[PDB]
Every structure is written in C-alpha cells, then in structure tokens.
C-alpha cells in the first residue's frame, strides 16, 4: 500500500540525452539512433525570429554535440516545426525502442530534467488543460523531454521550450508543435485559464479508498448532468460518458460507482475537508490518471 | 521556476535489479559487482524463524539469481545481519561507482520500486523520525532499495523488507541493520508516534519564498528557545543550533533570517493556512531537505 507521486524509471532515456551547442547557447538534445532533437530556438541570439532565416545562415559545424565525453559529428541539419533535427555521424547505441507521441490535456507523463546534457532529476507531471505544465526547470533545462513507458517502449511526449512570466512551462511535441497557442518567440504570451482534471481527481478518490481512506464517501448518488452543474461553477472540466467508462475497473474493484464517487467529489467541493487529508494531500489532486492509480495500486 | 517532489534519475540502479529466487519465493535483489543483496527472509515459509538454522539447510542451488533473461549461478551465499549475500560467478557488468550508507531520520532518499527484478517506479520520500518510510510498495517489492546520487557515486541507504499493519514500511541498509527497532519476523510491531521534521520544513518554506510565496512572511522573530516551544506543542521535532546553521546559504540568498522564518511558521502552526497554499501544497511539507532546496532551486 501507499501512494506516491512516481514517475517512470528515467534510465532509458537518460542514455538519449545530450547537449548541443550553437554559438554561445547551450541546451539539451534527445538523441535517438542518429538523430539529435532539440528546440530550434538555440540557433537565437529573438524577439521576432524568422528561423528559416537564421537557419539558412548555419552549417553543420556551427553545431557542437557532445555525448558524454565524446563530441558527435554533425553531417546535416533540418528543421521540422518547431524542433532541430541534427543527423550525426553515429548511431546511438542505447536507442530503446521508443515512439513519439503527442498526447491529450490531462494525460501525464515522466520528465527528465537535464543541464548541459546531463540528467539532474524525474519527476511527474501532467499536461493542464489550458496546454501549461507545471514543471520544475531552471535556465539550461530546454530540450530536456517528457516520457511514458509501456512494457519497454519509451513513448516521448514532450520537449521543454519555455518558462512563462508566471513561472509555468510551455513546450513541444517530439515533431515540434507546439502545444496549445504558444510560439517560440520572447513575447507577451499569457495562458488561458487553467481548470481541474475531474477524472483525475475522481481516480485519485479511489486511489483513496484502495488505500483505506473513506471518511469522505456518503450514501449519496447525483446524475451526471447534475454533477457537472457543480462543476463548471467550481472551475472542474466538465465529466463525460467515456470518462465514467474509463473510470470502469477501479469502480468495479472498489464496488463504489462512479456516480456515487461523484456525489463524495460534490460534498468535499462544498465543504471542503474539515481538517482532515486524503493520501497525505489537504488539497484534492488532479495529477494522478485512471491508468497511473490502477499502475501503481494494482500493478 | 517550479518546485517538484523530484527524485534522482534511476538508470544507475536499474542496471543492477535482479530477481532472486528461494522457494516459492521470489523477490528482488541488488546485483553489484560479483555479489547479489536480498533480503534474507527469501528463506522462509516465518512467525518466529532461526534465520541461521534456515540458512544452514540452503545450498547454492537453493537460489536462482535471474538478470534480464540470464540466469546467473551462485557460487557462495551468506548472511550480514539481515541481509542475504549471494556470490555469483560473473561481476554485474553495469556496476556504478556506489557507497552504502547509514542514513538519520530526516534525510530523503529516491526509491526504485520494483518487481520480479523489474523497474516499475521511482519516487522520493524521507526516513521518517520514527524510522519508517511511506513508501508505496505491492506484494513482490521486498528488496528495492531507496538511493542518493552525488556526482556520480550511487549511496545506497535502503533495502525494503516489510509493510507494517499501518500501511507504512520498515527495512534495512544495505549491510543488513533495520532503521528503528524493527525485526524481520510477522510478529506484532509498531512504529513509534510519528513527528514533523523541522528544519526541512524550514527548508521548504525557502524554496517557496525563492518561487515566490510570501504571504506566511511576517516582520517579527523569535528566539530558538521560544520557538521549540511552540514546535513541542505541534508535534514537531526540536530544532537545533546545528539546522539553523545548515539552513545558512538558504537565509542569505533569500536574506531571510531562519529565526525569521522560524516566526512565520509559528503562524502557521497557529493559524493555519486560511483557505491558502503554498508551493501547490495546503499543509507543511517536511519531505525536502536543505540541500534538496539548495539542488532543484539553484542547481
Ligand atoms: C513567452 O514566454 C516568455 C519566454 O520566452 C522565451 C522564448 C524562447 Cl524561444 C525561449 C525562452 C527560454 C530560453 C532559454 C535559454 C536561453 C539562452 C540559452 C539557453 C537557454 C536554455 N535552456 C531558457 N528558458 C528557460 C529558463 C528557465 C526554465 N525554462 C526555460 C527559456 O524559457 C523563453
Ligand atoms: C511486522 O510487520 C508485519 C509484516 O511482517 C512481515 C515480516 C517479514 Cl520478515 C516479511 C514481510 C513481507 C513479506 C513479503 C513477501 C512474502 C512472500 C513472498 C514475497 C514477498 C515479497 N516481496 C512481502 N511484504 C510486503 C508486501 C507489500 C509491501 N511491502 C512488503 C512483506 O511485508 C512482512
């Protein structure tokens, strides 16, 4: 028993990081067979780049990337939206086998935080509904990329571009677009209003009784339109049909359905918890999915 | 910016887990050079066992070492406290540079959780004042081991033997002596009352004004002596001279006094939050060293 915030072992990806360097820039590239990924704004010196200009103006040798110890020979270079491809000269030998992918708000993944090519920690986090995530990254940490692993296929999700005025993160999918509305540009650019995940939480109320958490369950039931009402008017994202569906196992081996689970979640936005916790949480979680609370209570 | 329970990167340990086989029982072992460390209760079937006379009645062939798809072979087996040595015949090619060490309570430490020898999750927690851990550990976890990293020297500080009734967890380091007064028999034990680690608390509370939470500042100070009374009161363990000058490079680079900080945590503990969070969170976490801040907030 327990519930922890746990990301996925980072050792696969950890033998893909390196750092590349472009004139007085340095940041992190992901290197997978003998490809290098990183964000293409290390060709900037950029409040209104036009990339295709500055690339035009580069040759492989304004490129240095250093693996390890060893520099890698750059033999060509391309752009794919928003991503640098850099081909080298050698394989990397430690490529899993791996896929890109680029996936829903509210999903999450494992990120690899990593200065001047170099893994410094892993931690979990989600993607928000208004496209942000909340990471923790310092100046150096671009190109450092976010991960699931499924039996041992590393799917990368997401390349780390920017920090945001407010301190919250903006990046990429693996081919480079963006996520949400942001560009990679030092701009005025604002997030839209952030909203809870409500099927997360609901996931996590039931990480809750797995774990022998109950004092918040009541012998109520609510309808999903009636639910919903609740929450738009406390900032939750709106439950669906297949959110109730995906919700299928952990209300079967709980025994508790999802409508009644819904009707705790309405009491707790109501009246709040009173001075108790849940899972060693004051606040109700949104970071933990169906599939990340039947990973880790259930195996 | 940002601040995440963040664990190290796990890759130098995956490449040492290994199942090991007694029995009926499998768990998981950590494969250094030519030596595989388990938990010695592999050998039982175990309401009072006479470990020495159970180990007496193995042989070599008793135990199957499984690393990846290669079986390994045991050519020596051994006891260190509460720990099982099994010599094999080939030095585990992926060694890193490593320690084992004993760690205090209050120190954190990253946890690979794994099963059947395979890395499942990575995780920080904190060995608790009363010398247990919660973790967030399924049937079959026994013998994943709780690690630091500096540079890049792996120091082993935890192996996990059991779950307590209260859903916490008890183990050993890795030369086999269990934190607290804990055995490895399924007999009646209890943790002692648990307290709140202070200083790190402190320390959590520097990496939340370094990210910009500062509505818990105030203008007054407190003496150590007067603020030891009011911990007392909450539960929290005494604060020391010694934390206090632990705490320094936070105190100057934020400018805060600790005696300073040590009056807004009385609020705290007073007043509580009032519908307020900090660091994402709405209570004290004392799961972040002074170091662990100093690491994630500056590099
Ligand atoms: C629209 O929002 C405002 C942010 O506008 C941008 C736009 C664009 Cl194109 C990029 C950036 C940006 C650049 C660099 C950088 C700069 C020079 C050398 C190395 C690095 C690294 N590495 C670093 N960071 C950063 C800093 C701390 C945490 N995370 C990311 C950044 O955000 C910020
Ligand atoms: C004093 O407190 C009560 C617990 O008494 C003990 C004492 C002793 Cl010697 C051991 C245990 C114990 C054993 C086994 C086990 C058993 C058989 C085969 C494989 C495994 C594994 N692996 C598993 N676990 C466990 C289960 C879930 C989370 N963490 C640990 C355990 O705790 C529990």
Same mark, same amino acid.
């Given at each position: /028993? ?11 990806? #950890? ?14 590239? =992901? ?11 290390? *060709?900037?010196?950029? =409040? ?9 103006? @580069? ?18 270079? /391309? ?15 430690? !490529?899993?086998?791996? @896929? ?16 001047? $090519? ?19 990254? =310092?100046? $150096? ?21 920017? #920090? ?22 030092? !701009? ?22 797995? +774990? ?9 039931? !609510? ?22 569906? *995906? ?18 979640? @309405? #009491? ?5 918890? +009173? ?11 949104? #970071? ?12």
């Amino acid at each position: /028993s327990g519930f922890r915030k746990m990301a996925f072992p980072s050792g696969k990806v #950890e033998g893909c990081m390196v750092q590349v360097t472009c004139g007085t820039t340095t940041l992190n590239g =992901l290197w997978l067979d003998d490809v290098v990924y990183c964000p293409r704004h290390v *060709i900037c010196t950029m =409040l209104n780049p036009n990339y295709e200009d500055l690339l035009i103006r @580069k040759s492989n040798h304004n490129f240095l990337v250093q693996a390890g110890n060893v520099q890698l020979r750059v033999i060509g270079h /391309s752009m794919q939206n928003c991503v640098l491809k850099l081909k080298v000269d050698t394989a990397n030998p430690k !490529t899993p086998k791996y @896929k890109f992918v680029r996936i829903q708000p509210g999903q999450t993944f494992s990120v690899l935080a990593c200065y001047n $090519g170099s893994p410094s920690g892993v931690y979990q986090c989600a993607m928000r509904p208004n496209f942000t995530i909340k990471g923790s990254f =310092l100046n $150096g940490s671009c190109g450092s990329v976010g991960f699931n692993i499924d039996y041992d296929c590393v799917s990368f999700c997401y390349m780390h571009h920017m #920090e945001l005025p407010t301190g919250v993160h903006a990046g990429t999918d693996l081919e480079g677009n963006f996520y949400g509305p942001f560009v990679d540009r030092q !701009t005025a650019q604002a997030a839209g209003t952030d909203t809870t995940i409500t099927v997360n939480v609901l996931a996590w109320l039931y990480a809750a009784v797995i +774990n022998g958490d109950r004092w918040f369950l009541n012998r109520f039931t !609510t309808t999903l339109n009636d639910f919903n009402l609740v929450a738009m008017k406390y900032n939750y994202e709106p439950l669906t049909q297949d959110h109730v569906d *995906i919700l299928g196992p952990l209300s079967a081996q709980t025994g508790i359905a999802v409508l009644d689970m819904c009707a705790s979640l @309405k #009491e707790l936005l109501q009246n709040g918890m +009173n001075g108790r916790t849940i899972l060693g949480s004051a606040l109700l979680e949104d #970071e933990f999915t169906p599939f990340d609370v039947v990973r880790q209570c259930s195996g």
